[PDB]
Amino acid sequence: XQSLFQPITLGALTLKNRIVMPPLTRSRASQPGDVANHMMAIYYAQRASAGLIVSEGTQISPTAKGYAWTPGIYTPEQIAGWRIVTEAVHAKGCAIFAQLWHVGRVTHPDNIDGQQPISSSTLKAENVKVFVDNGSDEPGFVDVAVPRAMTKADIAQVIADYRQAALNAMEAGFDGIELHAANGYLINQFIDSEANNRSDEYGGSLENRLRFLDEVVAALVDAIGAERVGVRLAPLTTLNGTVDADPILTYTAAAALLNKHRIVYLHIAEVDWDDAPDTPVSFKRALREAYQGVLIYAGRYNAEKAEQAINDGLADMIGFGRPFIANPDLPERLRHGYPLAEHVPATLFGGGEKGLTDYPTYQA
Ligand SMILES: Cc1cc2nc3c(=O)[nH]c(=O)nc-3n(C[C@H](O)[C@H](O)[C@H](O)COP(=O)(O)O)c2cc1C
Ligand SMILES: CCCCCCCCO[C@@H]1O[C@H](CO)[C@@H](O)[C@H](O)[C@H]1O
């Protein structure tokens, strides 16, 4: 754990250690309005011994939402709710980035004001569910809907929404933003060949499939500066329905594209739930050459594997998702080898403080 507990520079920030709390949707936002709130501020502040917190995905617009009760980042009230979170986290000595979210086709009309979802194409995500508010207090799991293909004007609108969301994140006191371009969501629906059947400049070729990513990143950087922009990618997981035919080429190219933009970090989502594909070390080393900023990995890491990934030169920082839900003091536990509590799946999403802020710190 020695390297894990070394500080690191992230742009203008000096971070305390190499541990990341990655984005974790908890579906706790206040209703009406999808507003980040008090229990969320406590929850994040409890976990501020991380070197970096990345917020749960926060939708950039009404039609960017995939799941019931996720917090937005587009209304004044939403910005203010996030400000209480960032104030709480900063009072603990910690950096926090907002994960800007557009789910594309991974949604249901019930979550997007009755609208049809949008995507690169008209392809439904196969074997994917989201959840909606069915009036009860538990999430209602539902099949996703068939999307409509984005027009040029839709592309411009979504870019504008991302750009503004980045400014809104700065107004909310975040230290930066993370673009969610992973786990089968909108940008990923353009990147991955089998999800993109466009015949315009946003599909077919590799250059074309990376174009939407390129243009979104350019707008984010123009708005808030490259030192405040991270990006999340999922080269090899396919759980939410996006498959690429040549992911080593596509994602090495994506990494090099992002390197050109000088984004402050690249975050690889190596596992999504139970989807834990073989991610060859040779490929990780290629990503390390293609992108020369801070490289973050998350997915089924423990203390041993995290330390090894850093010492092998594969990663600079490591995120721990599920363990951070149940262990607010995860860094201390990893450092000492204290046993980790396990999380309760039934309280991941929705509800209140139970299963959110009532996981204790370690006590022998
Ligand atoms: C409850 C839960 C919610 C999640 N929601 C998001 C999210 O909002 N954005 C995201 O990029 N990943 C999300 N993820 C994925 C995690 O960031 C992480 O990559 C994944 O859980 C693998 O890491 P782990 O094995 O350490 O949990 C979520 C994971 C969990 C368990
Ligand atoms: C009862 C708890 C059910 C846990 C099973 C999780 C259902 C899907 O969970 C979803 O996973 C996505 C990544 O695939 C995330 O981006 C979303 O934030 C999350 O809501």
TrEMBL record:
One of its GO terms (cellular component) is cytosol. The keyword DNA-binding does not apply. Its cofactor is FMN. This is NADH:flavin oxidoreductase Sye1. Belongs to the NADH:flavin oxidoreductase/NADH oxidase family. The keyword Hydrolase does not apply. It comes from the Bacteria. One of its GO terms (molecular function) is FMN binding. FMN binds at P23, T25, G57, Q99, R232, R300, G321, R322. InterPro entries: Aldolase_TIM, OxRdtase_FMN_N, Oye-like. Residues 3-339 form the NADH:flavin oxidoreductase/NADH oxidase N-terminal domain. It comes from Shewanella oneidensis (strain ATCC 700550 / JCM 31522 / CIP 106686 / LMG 19005 / NCIMB 14063 / MR-1). Keywords: Flavoprotein, FMN, Nucleotide-binding, Oxidoreductase.
